[PDB]
Amino acid sequence: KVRKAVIPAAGLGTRFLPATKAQPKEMLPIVDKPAIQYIVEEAAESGIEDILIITGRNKRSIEDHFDRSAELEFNLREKGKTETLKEMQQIADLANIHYIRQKEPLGLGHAVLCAEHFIGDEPFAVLLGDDIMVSETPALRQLMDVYDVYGTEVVGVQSVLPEDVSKYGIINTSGSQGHVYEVNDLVEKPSPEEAPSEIAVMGRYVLNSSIFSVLKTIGEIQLTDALREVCRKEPIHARLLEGNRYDIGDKLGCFKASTEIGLMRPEMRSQLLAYLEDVIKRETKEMLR
């Protein structure tokens, strides 16, 4: 049973300045939720009970977000917002959130190694926080279900258009079966010709304790290479992810994500669409002059 998960969150989030000048990338609101909350929500509903966040300096707000906020709870009760005061309490209840500091930044490989003693001897989940997934079955849960079966290192995938492939990590299927591709090798951001498929891994993984040894020997320790050297000995699995994927690596990415998820809320759906119609009308008019 996979019951533990690792979110690396040590990035200084430069792509988002000046929003992130003095506050973390992962706290940026997506609709009105911090990005990080979406990821912990994924994990909780996937049945993870314990999360380790590899954090850095001045990311106190993440730790605060998932605890009881006394001065807020008071202020909410003392104003009636009872539904809200309950929503806030639930956030602090999603999972047991552990923290470790990445000492200096040596990438998602060092980061995964930090988890070593915490997970110890289980299979664990890693969730980079690079995209938000809307699904009938939570994205990670789907990776776990392929794990429950094959019990090897499973990867989460979706297809992407050629001439996009240098942005992502790439499987190399010889076989494809059910909802589960079968991995023979792996490449980190290949040139469109170098690339042996149009399938990218979407910052979701389930891994084995084993992977720790593996990750240590290999060593700027890229995590993919350790999936590669596991593939030479033995072949892994990949799940095609049911659901909608919103990349949030960009300022624009985020705007899009805010909009699409916004459109899922009945209270904002119509207000939003109406507003977008009127922006376009206004932009056409101004343009024909």
Report the interface residues with a copy of itself, using CB under 8 A.
Answer: 12, 14, 16-19, 21-23, 27-29, 31-34, 37, 57-58, 61-62, 64-65, 67, 69, 71-72, 75-76, 79, 81, 84, 87-88, 91, 251-252, 255-256, 258-260, 262-263, 268, 271-273, 275-277, 279-280, 283
User: Whose Cβ is closer to a copy of itself: residue 35's or residue 227's?
Assistant: 35
Closest CA to 203 of 173, 169, 237: 169
Please state the closest distance from residue 187 (CB atom) to a copy of itself, in A.
Answer: 24
Q: In angstroms, rounded to a whole number, what is the distance separating the alpha carbons of residues 85 and 102?
A: 33
Closest CA to 243 of 85, 83, 133: 133
Please state the closest distance from residue 11 (CB atom) to a copy of itself, in A.
Answer: 10
Q: C-alpha angle 155/242/227, rounded to 5°?
A: 5
Please state the closest distance from residue 141 (CB atom) to a copy of itself, in A.
Answer: 23
Task: Report helix, strand or coil for 42.
Answer: helix
Q: In angstroms, rounded to a whole number, what is the distance separating the alpha carbons of residues 45 and 260?
A: 21
User: Whose Cβ is closer to a copy of itself: residue 23's or residue 197's?
Assistant: 23
User: Whose Cβ is closer to a copy of itself: residue 107's or residue 235's?
Assistant: 107
Please state the closest distance from residue 275 (CB atom) to a copy of itself, in A.
Answer: 6
User: Whose Cβ is closer to a copy of itself: residue 31's or residue 100's?
Assistant: 31
User: Whose Cβ is closer to a copy of itself: residue 240's or residue 272's?
Assistant: 272
Cβ distance 134 to 158 under 8 Å?
A: no
CA count, 13 A, side-chain hemisphere, 59: 25
